[PDB]
């Protein structure tokens, strides 16, 4: 029998994949570089799985073509086989955490939007964490090696030799933050339920202590029913100071005794609630219309690569399966996962404005 000649693949990875891998995450770069609005501590996880994926594009990819067009004969020098597959695993493992820390990352911002500076060095401990957890499960490549009398190599990992690394580093590179981005998905969904929710709790709050004040016929129903309000009111530390200012020049004027004076002093102080209510409702808006865009495209990410570690895993568990069809299934389930890796930090981008406004300045030569 005879196999035959495979390189219109090359040809269309090449004009699909490589090319929209490697200039996606220079534009990405560029962005970030170049403009001063994206220079933000958020995105420079994206600067990072940028250069991870670039990288992916520059040196993986085009070696794991020579698998397509050439033979099973590593046709290059030999230390250049495990240095080629340690850059593989581990810059393929580097994008998923990469996301597996934007996940929590996101969600930490919704939860306690407090925190903020402090935040350029959160971010380099992060990331220096996520490459070092990449370096980690890569490391065992390099280290076992690839099997040799002929000198020729076939540079690729065996059953036989990476069966408990091609499992467990499996669990570790991708079913673990897989398993962190479901939970931290479901703890997004009830972050900003109760966040809307004790919006709904406060506006009521308000608003019905205020019909108690404009038809009170005395002082004492002003007094008490402004209390109220008192206890339940950076720019966060003047947010509330304005009205709980406010309610004590009100109450001034209820332990003074004046009915219709204080009274027109809360009618007047609704022009300051829709003030801050209107903007925080809008934080929840803009808060839950960038989790689905999240949600929806790191789910399309983390899709894109089951096929790879489930055949990866099942290929060590299954004892029956056909090694010869499962590993023709690996030879493309993994070029699957590099457009995965190799477009995401493009699309997450192409939602931001910012993002791509700078793009199509960018794909003109302009630069600013
Ligand atoms: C045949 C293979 C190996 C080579 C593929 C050619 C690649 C490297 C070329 C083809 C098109 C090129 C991109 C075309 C557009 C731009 C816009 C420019 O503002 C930044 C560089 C960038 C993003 C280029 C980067 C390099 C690029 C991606
Ligand atoms: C030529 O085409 C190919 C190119 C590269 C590879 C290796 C693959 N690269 C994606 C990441 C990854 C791989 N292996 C792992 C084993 C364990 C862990 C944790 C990760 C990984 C294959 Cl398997 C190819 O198919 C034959
Ligand atoms: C496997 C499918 C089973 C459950 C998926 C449930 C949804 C899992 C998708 C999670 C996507 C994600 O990463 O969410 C992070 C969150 O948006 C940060 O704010």
Same mark, same amino acid.
């Given at each position: 029998? %005879?196999?035959?000649?495979?390189?219109?693949?090359?040809?269309?990875?090449?004009?699909?994949?490589?090319?929209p891998?490697?200039?996606?995450?220079?534009?990405?770069? /560029?962005?970030?570089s170049?403009?001063?609005?994206?220079?933000?501590?958020?995105?420079?996880?994206?600067?990072?799985?940028?250069?991870?994926?670039?990288?992916?594009? /520059?040196?993986?990819?085009?070696?794991?073509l020579?698998? @397509?067009?050439? %033979?099973?004969?590593?046709?290059?020098?030999?230390?250049?086989?495990?240095?080629?597959?340690?850059?593989?695993? *581990?810059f393929?493992?580097?994008?998923?955490?990469?996301?597996?820390?934007?996940?929590?990352?996101?969600?930490?911002?919704i939860?306690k939007?407090?925190?903020?500076?402090?935040?350029?060095?959160?971010?380099?401990?992060?990331?220096?964490?996520?490459?070092?957890?990449?370096?980690?499960?890569?490391?065992?490549?390099?280290? &076992?090696?690839?099997?040799?009398?002929?000198?020729?190599?076939?540079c690729? /990992?065996?059953?036989?030799?990476?069966?408990?690394?091609?499992?467990?580093?499996?669990?570790?590179?991708?079913?673990?933050?897989?398993?962190?981005?479901?939970?931290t998905?479901?703890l997004?969904?009830?972050?900003?339920?109760?966040?809307?929710?004790?919006?709904?709790?406060?506006?009521?709050?308000? +608003?019905?202590? *205020?019909?108690?004040?404009?038809?009170?016929?005395?002082?004492?129903?002003?007094?008490?029913?402004?209390?109220?309000?008192?206890?339940?009111?950076?720019?966060?530390?003047?947010?509330?100071?304005?009205?709980?200012?406010? @309610?004590?020049?009100?109450?001034? *004027?209820?332990? %003074?005794?004046?009915?219709?004076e204080a009274?027109?002093?809360?009618?007047?102080?609704?022009?300051?609630?829709?003030? !801050?209510?209107? &903007?925080?409702?809008?934080?929840?808006? +803009?808060?839950?219309?960038? #989790?689905?865009?999240?949600?929806?495209?790191?789910?399309?990410?983390? *899709?894109?690569?089951?096929?790879?570690?489930?055949?990866?895993?099942?290929?060590?568990?299954?004892?029956?399966?056909?090694?010869?069809?499962?590993?023709?299934?690996?030879?493309?389930?993994?070029?699957?996962?590099?457009? #995965?890796?190799?477009? +995401?930090?493009?699309? !997450?981008?192409?939602?931001?404005?910012?993002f791509?406004?700078?793009?199509?300045?960018? @794909?003109?030569?302009?630069?600013?």
């Open positions: 029998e %005879e196999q035959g000649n495979k390189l219109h693949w090359a040809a269309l990875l090449i004009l699909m994949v490589i090319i891998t490697i200039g996606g995450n220079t534009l990405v770069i /560029l962005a970030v170049l403009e001063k609005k994206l220079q933000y501590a958020t995105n420079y996880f994206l600067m990072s799985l940028a250069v991870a994926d670039l990288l992916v594009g /520059l040196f993986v990819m085009p070696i794991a020579l698998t @397509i067009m050439f %033979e099973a004969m590593w046709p290059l020098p030999l230390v250049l086989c495990p240095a080629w597959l340690f850059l593989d695993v *581990l393929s493992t580097a994008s998923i955490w990469h996301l597996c820390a934007i996940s929590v990352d996101r969600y930490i911002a939860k939007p407090i925190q903020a500076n402090n935040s350029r060095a959160t971010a380099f401990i992060k990331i220096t964490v996520v490459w070092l957890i990449s370096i980690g499960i890569a490391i065992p490549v390099p280290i &076992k090696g690839i099997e040799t009398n002929p000198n020729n190599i076939t690729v /990992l065996t059953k036989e030799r990476f069966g408990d690394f091609m499992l467990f580093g499996s669990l570790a590179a991708f079913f673990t933050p897989l398993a962190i981005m479901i939970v998905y479901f997004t969904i009830h972050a900003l339920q109760k966040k809307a929710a004790d919006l709904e709790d406060n506006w009521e709050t308000l +608003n019905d202590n *205020l019909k108690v004040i404009e038809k009170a016929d005395n002082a004492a129903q002003v007094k008490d029913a402004l209390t109220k309000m008192r206890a339940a009111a950076k720019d966060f530390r003047h947010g509330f100071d304005i009205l709980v200012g406010q @309610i004590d020049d009100a109450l001034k *004027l209820a332990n %003074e005794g004046k009915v219709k009274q027109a002093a809360a009618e007047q102080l609704k022009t300051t609630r829709n003030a !801050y209510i209107q &903007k925080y409702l809008q934080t929840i808006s +803009n808060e839950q219309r960038a #989790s689905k865009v999240l949600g929806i495209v790191f789910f399309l990410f983390l *899709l894109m690569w089951c096929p790879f570690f489930i055949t990866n895993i099942t290929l060590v568990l299954c004892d029956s399966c056909n090694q010869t069809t499962l590993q023709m299934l690996l030879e493309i389930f993994v070029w699957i996962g590099y457009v #995965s890796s190799g477009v +995401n930090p493009l699309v !997450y981008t192409l939602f931001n404005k910012t791509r406004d700078a793009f199509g300045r960018y @794909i003109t030569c302009n630069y600013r």
